Amino acid sequence: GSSGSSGRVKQLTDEEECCICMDGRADLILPCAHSFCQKCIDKWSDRHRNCPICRLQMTGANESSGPSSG
Ligand SMILES: [Zn+2]
Numbered sequence: 001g002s003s004g005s006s007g008r009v010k011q012l013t014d015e016e017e018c019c020i021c022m023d024g025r026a027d028l029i030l031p032c033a034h035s036f037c038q039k040c041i042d043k044w045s046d047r048h049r050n051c052p053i054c055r056l057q058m059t060g061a062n063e064s065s066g067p068s069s070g
């Protein structure tokens, strides 16, 4: 009713934020709706322009590319 400690108006200043950890802000953003902060980006040795999320292709769409022997 007329009680409660938490539960007040919260400014929407924030606009974007990492997707992996989602701390508060995002260092960069991808054209596929995927952002990553310095922390994470740095963590992932292979920080190639390539997108990690998409790369996974988890229940995405029919796209044949091919494995990587290396
Ligand atoms: Zn992050």
Ligand SMILES: [Zn+2]
Residues within 6 Å of the ligand: 030, 032, 033, 034, 051, 052, 053, 054, 055
């Ligand atoms: Zn992506």
